[PDB]
């Protein structure tokens with residue numbers, strides 16, 4: 001356990017908890033985008049995932065929202081054996097975007113971006129960055145400080161695809177009972193490329209809060225004085241470490257492909273490796289964070305970081321992230337752990 005890590009955790013907490021009108025500005029903007037969307041024939045059934053979210057743990061002005069469409073009786077077809085990327089096949093409100101049997105993501109996104117750019121001019125009471133990529137579909141910069149990512153997703157209440165059968169390896173930590181209840185939850189499909197095909201990536205981002213709010217082997221983890229763990233604190237420090245390193249080397253392109261998603265995936269693999277609440281005592285914060293730092297470094301060094309839900313999907317493969325980029329991050333983190341983390345300064 002370190003007083004530096006603890007002081008950083010206290011700073012992050014005060015930044016997160018203090019009075020901000022930001023979420024209110026975003027809510028206004030989102031509720032009017034959603035209203036103008038429900039007027040359109042194809043986007044009539046659109047809704048916010050949860051009735052907001054943040055990618056970066058340090059920046060309270062950067063937001064992350066999902067607009068979802070329930071797609072009952074969905075037919076999925078795995079693209080090029082990618083395990084995570086699928087064609088969407090099936091009258092219903094989404095027949096307008098069809099090309100034969102396959103549902104077009106590019107055409108759906110073109111209409112989505114069109115209606116938002118139009119509503120950006122409507123709200124005179126917000127600069128839209130039409131940055132290429134399906135997920136997030138759009139990034140708004142409300143005023144000169146606030147940033148909002150909007151993702152369009154399809155929701156399916158059918159059993160999770162076969163590629164997930166060995167994923168969510170939580171049975172020795174959270175129990176097979178919990179693994180089974182979670183697998184009954186829906187799954188999402190976001191427009192993404194594995195670069196010119198009508199493919200959708202499987203998303204289980206909604207499962208994170210479910211586990212983070214009930215993360216112990218003990219049902220009483222963090223519910224009392226004698227059972228306070230450092231799992232969330234470790235996850236927060238891992239995320240801040242990457243954010244600060246990305247900010248430190250933003251002028252070069254070497255850390256552009258790394259995201260908090262990679263940090264989260266590696267952190268949850270350490271949760272599977274260390275299932276006992278005793279392997280996460282709050283007093284051992286320093287050691288636990290280091291087991292997290294060591295595991296992520298091993299991931300980069302071996303070019304192996306499995307999608308937590310799709311074991312055959314390597315987030316760190318040479319085809320997704322180059323060796324040079326991973327070695328650059330490996331060197332940067334090694335310098336941070338061998339200089340008392342200079343990013344955690346103040």
Ligand SMILES: Cc1ccc(-c2cc(C(=O)O)c3[nH]c(CN4CCN(Cc5ccccc5)CC4)nc3c2)c(Cl)c1
Pocket residue numbers: 049050053055064065066151202203204205206207208209211261264265268308309
């Ligand atoms: C145990 C466990 C559980 C869950 C995950 C998980 C899985 C996935 C995944 O895609 O399967 C993730 N994806 C991202 C990044 N996204 C960026 C875009 N945001 C849009 C949004 C905005 C608002 C509301 C919904 C959606 C959501 C967060 N974190 C993810 C985390 C992991 Cl690793 C382990």
Ligand SMILES: [Cl-]
Pocket residue numbers: 012013016057236
């Ligand atoms: Cl925080």
Ligand SMILES: [Cl-]
Pocket residue numbers: 055259260261
């Ligand atoms: Cl992310």
Ligand SMILES: [Zn+2]
Pocket residue numbers: 215216221222227228229230231
């Ligand atoms: Zn706990």
